[PDB]
Amino acid sequence: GSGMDEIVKVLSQHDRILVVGHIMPDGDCVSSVLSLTLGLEKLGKEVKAAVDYKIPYVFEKFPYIDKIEENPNFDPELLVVVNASSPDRIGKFQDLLDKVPSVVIDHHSTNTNFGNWNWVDPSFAATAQMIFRINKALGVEYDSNLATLNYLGIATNTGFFRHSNADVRVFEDAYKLVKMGADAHFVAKEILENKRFEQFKLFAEVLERLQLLENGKIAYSYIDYDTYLRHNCTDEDSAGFVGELRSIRGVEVAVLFMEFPRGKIHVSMRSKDWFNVNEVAFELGGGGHPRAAGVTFEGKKIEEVIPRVINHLLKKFKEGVES
Ligand SMILES: [Cl-]
Numbered sequence: 001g002s003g004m005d006e007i008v009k010v011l012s013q014h015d016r017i018l019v020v021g022h023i024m025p026d027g028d029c030v031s032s033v034l035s036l037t038l039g040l041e042k043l044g045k046e047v048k049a050a051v052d053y054k055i056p057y058v059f060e061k062f063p064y065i066d067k068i069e070e071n072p073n074f075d076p077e078l079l080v081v082v083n084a085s086s087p088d089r090i091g092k093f094q095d096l097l098d099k100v101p102s103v104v105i106d107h108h109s110t111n112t113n114f115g116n117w118n119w120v121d122p123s124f125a126a127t128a129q130m131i132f133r134i135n136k137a138l139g140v141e142y143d144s145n146l147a148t149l150n151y152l153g154i155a156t157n158t159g160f161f162r163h164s165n166a167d168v169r170v171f172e173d174a175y176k177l178v179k180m181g182a183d184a185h186f187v188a189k190e191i192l193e194n195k196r197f198e199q200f201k202l203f204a205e206v207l208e209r210l211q212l213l214e215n216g217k218i219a220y221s222y223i224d225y226d227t228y229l230r231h232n233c234t235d236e237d238s239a240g241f242v243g244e245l246r247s248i249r250g251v252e253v254a255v256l257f258m259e260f261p262r263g264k265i266h267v268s269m270r271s272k273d274w275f276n277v278n279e280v281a282f283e284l285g286g287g288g289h290p291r292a293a294g295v296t297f298e299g300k301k302i303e304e305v306i307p308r309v310i311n312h313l314l315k316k317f318k319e320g321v322e323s
């Protein structure tokens, strides 16, 4: 599809821009939305930012977080959708795709290329890294606030420099941003040192349901909808739980099944050394990365999804072991 140079040209040609992120926004969504919005505003453009979803509490102290609106009153010339793989992921703003020329910028290999112009590069760990390069190509100069906001998505999507994607390019980008004043400690404190007591109790439920398979190489658990309700939690509160299960010594693949809301089952998969969970996810209707992937089902009992997913995982695991 289009490369960065074409996207930079299109952005340079329009001065009234609506930047839209996806529902259930994460660090890379917030980082990409705000870094692009503020970068474009430094070029003098009139820019609003929007997400059709509540912003998670861990973002509440971030500079300019209030710039992300739920109901922008705005007549944009250009819609720029960041970090969203498909039109359904941007909620009510998908209606604008029929009316406003659109740019898509994303790192997800599952992106449906739904914009008029699309720059999709799955070699980046974070869409925020693509925004960083676009801002530089446009001539934007960062201050510490913009550096912090752009650092956020690189940090969150690499697990704060822990996952397999924490490579030279990630460390180069992070060093550049920290040199420009990015507050790495602030970002870690707000994202990671903000636990609710209810989250400890919710993870205790996960451990109570934990099952090991294949001589300890596979671990899985689940959170049904009533269990979220019992602890005054949503699927916001189980973020990172599946990584805790992968962190068990000897576990190669961890899987967590999450029902929220009723009958919506999200399956999060993580692997350690060799098992390609993106292949298992894709075969089930989802996708992702070799070490972290997922799939989402609508209209199914958690009791039906769990054994079907575990069955396919076990068959793929046995096939993988046989060299
Ligand atoms: Cl990775």
Ligand SMILES: [Cl-]
Residues within 6 Å of the ligand: 239, 240, 241, 242, 243, 244, 270
């Ligand atoms: Cl995780």
